[PDB]
Structure 1
């Protein structure tokens, strides 16, 4: 068995190996990368996502989200308070202000320590989940707006044609902006490219151990657990590495820097935070190996998780028993 300790693997494809996206994902899995839940891909030195980022300031963040925490430093939830629209230029200036900027620090470990110590005492503003792309149309390799769609993968593997579309999303971050512990919708893959700015630290639980994280989360968030049998689908709960270690939960961590891709694998729980002003682009995707994960994915039917148009068809075809109840949640 490849990668039996489930370590995060880092790949350095050549420009020739960067041509065929599907084939490279399958290669990484042949080496055991999926066992970690997360892999890093450093693009060949010849590649670029676009020529410059000098002209992005007028992108609108229609609904910036202020991430307000509750709980204790290592075990907390966050809720998202909607703020007034602002441009990316306005948001960058806000991120760099004395109230929101990254503190002085020695290295990524010191910054990580400071994040876990102090996150709950601040409410950073995240420009998350913005439909769009920063890849140049002429970038032919690993262009997250030109990937094969999940609906086409389902149709190729299973023969059924379904409605829905699959487009990327932009994330503009600042110091302390946080992504809560989650797997993807329908336990899909995700791919995330850090276009510019300061790093993003990731934490990940191996897919084979995901239920250990779920059992800890039920213990730590006991009212949420009674409310919903899949409350991590709400994407609000945070648990620190110190707490995970105290409870014996297997996990790994890695920091992504600008110019790097991360891939999350089916049922790989992940969480993390931004170091300072940055912009990432991410999208879900599927492979043949995903189909069985999609059939088994948990679902929120309490109504809180409220998700995309395209997830309807995935539930309807892969999980027809659940369909009915899940759709009562979504209506």
Structure 2
């Protein structure tokens, strides 16, 4: 078995190997990359996502989210308070202000220490989940707006044509902006490209050990657990590496820098934080290997998780027993 310790693997494809996306994902899996839940892909030196980032300031962040924490430094939840619209140029200036900017630090480890010590005492503002793309239309390789769709994968594998679409999303971050512990909708893959700015630190639990994280989460968030049998779908709970280590949960960490891709694999729980002003683009995708994970994915039916139009068909076809109850949650 390849990668039996479930380490995060880092790949350096050549420009030739960067042509065929599906083939390269299958290659990484042949080497055991999925066992980690997360892999890094450094693009060939010849590749670029677009020519420059000099003209992005007028993108609108219609609903910036203030991430307010509750709990203790290592075990907390966050809620998202909606703020007034602002442009990316306005948001960059805010991220660089004295109130929100990255503090002085020695290295990524010192910054990580500061994040876990101090996150709860601040409420950073995240421009998340913005439909759109920063890839130039002429970028042919690993263009996250030109991937094969999940609906087409399901049709190819299973023969059933379904409604729905699959487009990318932009994320504008600042120091301390946080992504809570989660797997993807329907335990899909994700791919995330850090277009510009400061790094993003990731934490990940191997898919084979995801239920250990779930059991810890039920213990740490006991009211949320009684409220919903899949409350990590709400995407609000944070647990620090120190707490994970104290409770014996297998996990790994890595820092993504600008110009790098990350892939999350089906049922790979992940969480993390941004180091400073940045912009990422991410989208879900599927492969043949996903179908079995899609069939077994948990679902939130309490009503909190509320997701896209396109998830309907995935539930309806892959999980017809759950359909009814999950749709009640969605309406």
Q: Fold-level match, TM-score > 0.5?
A: yes
Deviation at 1:73, TM superposition (A): 0.0
Alpha-carbon deviation of 1:25? Answer: 0.0
**What is the aligned length?**
331
How far did residue 285 of structure 1 move? Answer: 0.0
Alpha-carbon separation, structure 1, partners of 2:328 and 2:199: 40
* C-alpha displacement of 1:312: 0.1
Q: Which runs of 5+ in 2 are unaligned?
A: none
> C-alpha distance in 2, partners of 1:160/1:175?
44
Report the CA distance between 1:126 and its aligned residue: 0.0
Q: Is 1:317 aligned to residue 317 of structure 2?
A: yes
1:218 CA displacement: 0.0
Per-residue deviation at 1:159? 0.1
Cα displacement string for residues 291-331 of structure 1 (whole angstroms, at most 9, x for unaligned residues): 00000000000000000000000000000000000000000
| TM-score normalised over the length of structure 1 | 1.00
Tell me, in whole angstroms, the C-alpha distance in 1 between the residues paired with 2:40 and 2:237.
Answer: 24
Q: 1:185: Cα distance to partner? A: 0.0
TM-score scaled by length of structure 2? 1.00
In structure 2, how many angstroms separate the alpha carbons of the residues matched to 1:235 and 1:247? 21
Q: Give the drift of 1:154.
A: 0.1
Q: Report the CA distance between 1:242 and its aligned residue.
A: 0.0
Deviations 1:31-74 (A, max 9, x none): 00000000000000000000000000000000000000000000
The answer to whether structure 1 residue 5 and structure 2 residue 5 are counterparts is: yes
User: Using the alignment, how far apart are the partners of 1:41 and 1:262 within structure 2?
Assistant: 6
Q: Does residue 1:63 correspond to 2:63, yes or no?
A: yes
Q: What secondary structure is seen at the aligned counterpart in 2 of 1:138?
A: coil
CA distance in 1, matches of 2:296, 2:307: 18
**Counterpart-to-counterpart distance in 1, 2:287 and 2:151:** 11
**Would you identify which runs of 4 or more consecutive aligned residues in structure 1 move more than 2 Å?**
none
Shift of 1:165: 0.0
- Alignment of structure 1 residues 155-174 onto 2, 5 Å: 155-174=155-174
For structure 1, which runs of at least 5 residues remain unmatched after alignment? none
Superimposed CA distance per residue, residues 142-191 of structure 1 (whole angstroms, 9 cap, x where no aligned partner): 00000000000000000000000000000000000000000000000000
Q: Hey, what's the Cα distance between the residues in 2 that align with 1:329 and 1:233?
A: 12
Could you tell me how far 1:280 is from its partner in structure 2?
0.0
Deviation readout 1:194-218 (Å, 9 max, x if unpaired):
0000000000000000000000000
Q: What's 1:213 paired with?
A: 213
Shift, 1:270, TM fit: 0.0
**Residue 289 (structure 1) shift:** 0.0
Residue 95 of structure 1 aligns with which residue? 95
In structure 2, what is the Cα distance between the partners aligned to 1:3 and 1:272? 23
Q: Which residue of 2 aligns with 1:285?
A: 285
RMSD of the TM alignment (CA)? 0.1
1:61-210 aligned at under 5 Å gives the runs 61-210=61-210
Shift in Å at residue 256 of structure 1?
Answer: 0.0
Secondary structure of 1:27's counterpart equals helix
